Structure 1
Amino acid sequence: MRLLVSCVDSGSIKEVLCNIGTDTSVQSALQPFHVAPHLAEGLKAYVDRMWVISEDEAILARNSGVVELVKISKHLKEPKFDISEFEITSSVSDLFDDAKVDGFVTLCPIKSNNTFVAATKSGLLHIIKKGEDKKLIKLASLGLKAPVEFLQLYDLEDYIFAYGGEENLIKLVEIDSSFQSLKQIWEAKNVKNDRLDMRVPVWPMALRFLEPSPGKTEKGKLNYQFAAITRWSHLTKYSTQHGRKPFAQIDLLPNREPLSQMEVFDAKGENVVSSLGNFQSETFNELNVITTDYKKNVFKFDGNGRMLGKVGRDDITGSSTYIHVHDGKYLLQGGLDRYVRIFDIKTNKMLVKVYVGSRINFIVMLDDVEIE
Structure 2
Amino acid sequence: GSMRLLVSCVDSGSIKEVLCNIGTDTSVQSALQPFHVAPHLAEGLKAYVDRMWVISEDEAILARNSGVVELVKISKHLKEPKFDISEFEITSSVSDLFDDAKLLVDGFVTLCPIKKSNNTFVAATKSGLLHIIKKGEDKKLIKLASLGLKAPVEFLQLYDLEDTDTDKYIFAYGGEENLIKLVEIDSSFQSLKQIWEAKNVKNDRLDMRVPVWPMALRFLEPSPGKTEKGKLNYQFAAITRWSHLTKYSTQHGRKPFAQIDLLPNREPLSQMEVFDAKGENVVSSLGNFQSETFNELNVITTDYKKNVFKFDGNGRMLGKVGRDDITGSSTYIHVHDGKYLLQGGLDRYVRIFDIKTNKMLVKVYVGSRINFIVMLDDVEIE
Shorter-chain TM-score category?
A: over 0.9
Take 1:370 and 1:320, find their aligned partners in 2: how far apart are those partners? Answer: 31
Q: CA RMSD in A?
A: 0.7
Stretches of 4+ moved more than 6 A in 1? none
Q: 1:75-128 CA deviation, whole Å, 9 max, x = no partner?
A: 011111110000000000000000110000000000411000000000000000
Report if the CA contact (8 A) 1:19-1:370 is conserved: no
* CA shift digits 1:286-313 (9 cap, x unpaired): 0000000000000000000000000000
CA distance in 2, matches of 1:17, 1:369: 8
Q: Distance in 2 between matches of 1:367 and 1:302?
A: 30
1:260 alignment counterpart: 270
Q: Percent identity?
A: 100
Q: Distance in 1 between matches of 2:81 and 2:316?
A: 45
CA distance in 2, matches of 1:367, 1:346: 21
Provide the C-alpha distance between the structure 2 equivalents of 1:325 and 1:57, rounded to a whole number of angstroms: 21
Q: 1:202-254 CA distances to partner (integer Å, 9 max, x unpaired)?
A: 00000000000000000000000000000000000000000000000000000
Give the Cα–Cα distance (whole angstroms) in 1 for the partners of residues 206 and 101 of structure 2.
37
Q: Secondary structure of the equivalent of 1:367?
A: coil
The aligned residue for residue 19 of structure 1 is 21
The gaps in structure 1 that reach 5 residues or longer are: none
Instruction: Provide the rounded CA distance (Å) in 1 between the counterparts of 2:186 and 2:23.
Output: 48
In 1: Cα distance, 2:380 partner to 2:331 partner: 27
Structure 2 counterpart of 1:9: 11
- How many Å apart are 1:265 and its aligned residue? 0.2
- With over 3 angstroms needed to count, the CA separation of the structure-2 counterparts of 1:258 and 1:370, relative to structure 1, is farther
Q: CA deviation at 1:369?
A: 4.8
Name the CA shift for 1:337/1:371 in 2 (closer, same or farther; >3 Å): farther
SS of residue matched to 2:12: coil
Structure-1 separation of matches of 2:377 and 2:216: 26
TM-score (norm: length of structure 2): 0.96
Question: How many aligned positions are there?
Answer: 371
Q: Deviations over 1:41-81 (max 9, x none)?
A: 00000000000000000000000000000000000111111
C-alpha distance in 2, partners of 1:231/1:334? 20
Q: Using a 3 Å threshold, how does the CA distance of structure 1 residues 297 and 370 change in structure 2: closer, same or farther?
A: farther
SS of the residue 2:11 aligns to: coil
Deviation digits for residues 132-191 of structure 1, max 9, x if unmatched?
A: 00000000000000000000000011x000000000000000000000000000000000
Give the match for residue 337 of structure 1.
347
8 Å Cα contact 1:191-1:200 kept in structure 2? yes
**Distance in 2 separating the partners of 1:369 and 1:27:** 24
Partners of 1:174 and 1:212 lie apart in 2 by 16
Equivalent residues of 2:57, 2:377 under 8 A apart = no
SS at match of 1:292: strand
Bigger mean CA deviation after superposition, 290-299 or 362-371: 362-371
1:102 and 2:112 correspond: no
Closer, same or farther in 2 for the Cα pair 1:91/1:232, shift >3 Å?
same
Q: Is the 8 A contact 1:48 1:63 kept in 2?
A: yes
Answer whether contact 1:19 1:371 (CA < 8 A) is retained: no
Post-superposition shift, 1:367?
Answer: 2.1
Asked whether the equivalents of residues 175 and 214 of structure 2 are also in contact (C-alpha less than 8 Å), the reply is: yes
Instruction: Name 1:309's counterpart in structure 2.
Output: 319
Cα distance between partner residues in 1 of 2:261 and 2:300: 15
Q: Which residue of 1 aligns with 2:148?
A: 143
Give the deviation of 1:371 after TM superposition. 5.0
SS in 1 for 2:376: strand
After superposition, the Cα gap between the structure-2 partners of 1:126 and 1:211, relative to the gap in structure 1 and judged at 3 Å, is same
- Cα separation, 1, equivalents of 2:100 and 2:255: 32
Q: Distance in 2 between matches of 1:183 and 1:50?
A: 28
Q: Distance in 2 between matches of 1:195 and 1:49?
A: 40
Could you tell me which residue of structure 2 aligns to residue 346 of structure 1? 356
**What secondary structure does 1:48 align onto?**
strand
Q: 1:286 to 1:369 in 2, by over 3 A?
A: farther
Find the partner of 2:223 among 213, 223, 242.
213
Distance in 2 of aligned mates of 1:167 and 1:190: 10
* Compared CA separation, residues 323 and 371, structure 1 to 2 (3 A): farther
Tell me: CA distance 1:228–1:257, structure 2 relative to 1, closer, same or farther (3 Å): same
Q: Distance in 2 between matches of 1:367 and 1:279?
A: 24
Contact 2:83 2:379 in 1 (8 A): no
Report the 3-state secondary structure (helix = DSSP H, G, I; strand = E; otherwise coil) of the residue aligned with 1:44: helix
Aligned equivalent of 1:280: 290
CA offsets 1:239-294 (integer angstroms, 9 cap, x no match): 00000000000000000100000000000000000000000000000000000000
* 1:322-351: CA deviation from partner (whole Å, max 9, x where unpaired): 000000000000000000000000000000
For residue 368 of structure 1, report the CA deviation from its aligned partner. Answer: 3.9
Deviation, 1:370, is 7.5
Structure 2, unpaired ranges of 5+: 163-168
User: Does the CA contact (< 8 Å) of 1:66 and 1:91 recur in 2?
Assistant: yes
| Structure 2 SS opposite 1:9 | helix
Tell me how far apart the structure 2 counterparts of residues 321 and 117 of structure 1 sit (CA, whole Å).
22
SS at 2:110 equivalent = strand
Query: d(CA) in 2 for partners of 1:355 and 1:107?
Result: 26
Asked whether the equivalents of residues 126 and 153 of structure 2 are also in contact (C-alpha less than 8 Å), the reply is yes
Deviations 1:4-44 (A, max 9, x none): 00000000000000000000000100000000000000000
